[PDB]
Symmetry: D3
Subunit: 61 residues, 6 copies
């Protein structure tokens, strides 16, 4: 869907923590602020945004 979730998240062991995510084809989630893709068809995209929290796992699988 367009709603924000994340399956693989990583955080730094600092306080507050700094965390990020994974891969989608053509577009990133609606909440993403800087999105990076491959110059190809279909393009494989990732979110580069960093927060002090992780989104919840994608509810499907």
């Amino acid at each position: 869907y367009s709603k924000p979730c994340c399956d693989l998240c990583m955080c730094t062991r600092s306080m507050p923590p700094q965390c990020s995510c994974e891969d989608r084809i053509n577009s990133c989630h609606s909440d993403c602020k800087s999105c990076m893709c491959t110059r190809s068809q279909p393009g494989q995209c990732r979110c580069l945004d960093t927060n002090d929290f992780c989104y919840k796992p994608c509810k499907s699988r």
Copy 2:
């Protein structure tokens, strides 16, 4: 969901083609025959099965 789809697929340039896929947490799709995971909680899994076709992209994103 439990239904079979695939976002990143790769095939050999032979006839018939030999193709495979990507990553899920704890479990693989219902149609998967040999599934491999990391000894960790939560475990990150992948399907090793090979077909002569690709499933369609996950309908959500």
Copy 3:
């Protein structure tokens, strides 16, 4: 070009050795026997063939 070379090669510490390679867009080298690509435009390909020798580095860079 169409000529066979390899930049990143890996071999098993057995006798005779078993060795393979890396990445190209749309097509593999002319000598490649089983070539695998991504269902996308432009497709990113790799050779899965195994020999008991490595090709020489690509002469360009």
Copy 4:
């Protein structure tokens, strides 16, 4: 050669875009400004520079 090209490029979905590239043994292209390699022989290098455009694919393969 020494001339600047790129096979795998990625860009952020922002305006202007922010883009980067891939892998070479011992040295990066002549136009590269910050180049990073592995402490090994032969060393495997990558360019970390970021532009608002992508170079064209390497003309050979």
Copy 5:
């Protein structure tokens, strides 16, 4: 040391399971039967052997 351990292990969800491991510079563990390295100095090696069990984590870190 020369003793056999493994930090990152992966297994198939079949019975009995089929499992493997990770990365070392110049040589693999003493128990490894097919070891694969990069044609470079120092070479980065991995074990390709498959068992129906995982070794224990490296005791150091």
Copy 6:
């Protein structure tokens, strides 16, 4: 152990150089200043710190 070493190091071809490292389960070395891990059990961690030198290879293997 808790002592600082590094097996895979990479540096930029600038003066002074800017260098970093690799992977551990649950914790980073004692000298690490910003450490990033996966939200999972056991978590896989990496050091993001950058210096103008590389640590020496882990003395064990």
